[PDB]
Amino acid sequence: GIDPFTESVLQSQATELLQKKAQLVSFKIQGIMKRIFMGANTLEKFLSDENSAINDTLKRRMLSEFLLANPHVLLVSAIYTNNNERVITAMSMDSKIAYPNTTLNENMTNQIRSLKSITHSDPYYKEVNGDKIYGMDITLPLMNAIGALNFFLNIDAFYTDVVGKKKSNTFLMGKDGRLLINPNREIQDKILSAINPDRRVAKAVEYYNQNEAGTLSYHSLSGNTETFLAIQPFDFFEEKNHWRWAIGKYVNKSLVFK
């Protein structure tokens, strides 16, 4: 406390460690998401093939295998709009893969036929078997499009990837400071600046918007104290803003400085 040398050393050490840990979490998430999108690309080639010996049954098998390999995906749907309009859906709930019957509504329909690049929805709670599951829809055009591939990314399935096996001071942030994952589940889907008066939050969101890693001092909700907070932004999808998340990790100044 009394010593500026010690303080500088301890601070620098603690904020470097914070950033290192946040980078590891984000790298793990990116790896998970890379596998999702690679598989979705593979599925798109099979589901959109002109001259296929593949019937709806074998399409179902491949969709269910996608789910087996990617447990962070709750369901996946091959939606055809061209002719013989139909929805083929595999869904993974509990440990069993079902094939619910979806009828294509005019809501989904035209959005799909004019679709010419990948999109995603805003995060939302989907009701399933009386439970709300936090996630988002991701939609790829079946290629001029003959229909669409849609899957529901289960954001809740990333809970342990973000927070760890033990509770920790780690969260996943989305657009404008929205909390996608938080150890305190009840502040999920909340805007951070709307539930935290600390105006240094803006600098967090700004690190996010600028897309570089950075640290800042920050008053936490879960600890109600002064912390260092690291922000690690990363794209959860790569094309060549819209597909950007960030890991937040923080530590009590009272702990850093003895």
Author numbering: 28 to 170, 175 to 271, 276 to 293
Text from the published report:
Extracellular chemicals are sensed by chemoreceptors, also termed transducer-like proteins (Tlps). Most of the characterised Tlps are dimeric membrane proteins that comprise an extracytoplasmic ligand-binding domain (LBD), the transmembrane region, the HAMP (histidine kinases, adenylyl cyclases, methyl-accepting protein, and phosphatases) domain and the methyl-accepting (MA) domain, the latter transmitting information to a signalling cascade. H. pylori tlpC mutants are outcompeted by wild type during stomach colonisation, and TlpC modulates the chemotactic response to acid. In common with family 1 histidine kinases, the TlpC LBD has a dCACHE fold, and is composed of a membrane-proximal and membrane-distal PAS-like modules folding against the N-terminal and C-terminal halves of a long stalk helix, respectively.
In this paper, we report the crystal structure of LBD of H. pylori TlpC in complex with a small-molecule ligand that co-purified with the protein. The three-dimensional structure of recombinant H. pylori TlpC LBD (residues 34–297 plus six additional residues (GIDPFT) at the N-terminus, introduced as an artifact of the cloning procedure), was determined by X-ray crystallography using a single-wavelength anomalous dispersion (SAD) technique to a resolution of 2.2 Å. The TlpC LBD crystals (hereafter referred to as form A) belonged to the space group C2, with three molecules in the asymmetric unit related to each other by a three-fold pseudo-symmetry. The ligand was bound to the membrane-proximal subdomain. Based on the analysis of the electron density maps and the chemical nature of the ligand-binding pocket, we hypothesised and confirmed the ligand to be lactate. The lactate binding site is located in a pocket formed by residues F202, L210, N213, I218, L223, Y249, L252, S253, and Y285. The carboxyl and hydroxyl groups of lactate form hydrogen bonds with the side chains of N213, Y249 and Y285, and with the main-chain amides of L252 and S253. The TlpC LBD/lactate complex is further stabilised by hydrophobic interactions between the methyl group of lactate and the side chains of F202, L210, I218 and L223. ITC measurements demonstrated that each of the N213A, I218A, Y285A and Y249F substitutions abolished the binding of lactate to TlpC LBD. Our analysis of the structural basis of lactate recognition by H. pylori chemoreceptor TlpC changes this paradigm regarding the mechanism of sensing by dCACHE domain by providing the first example where direct sensing of the signal molecule is mediated by the ligand binding to the membrane-proximal, rather than membrane-distal, subdomain.
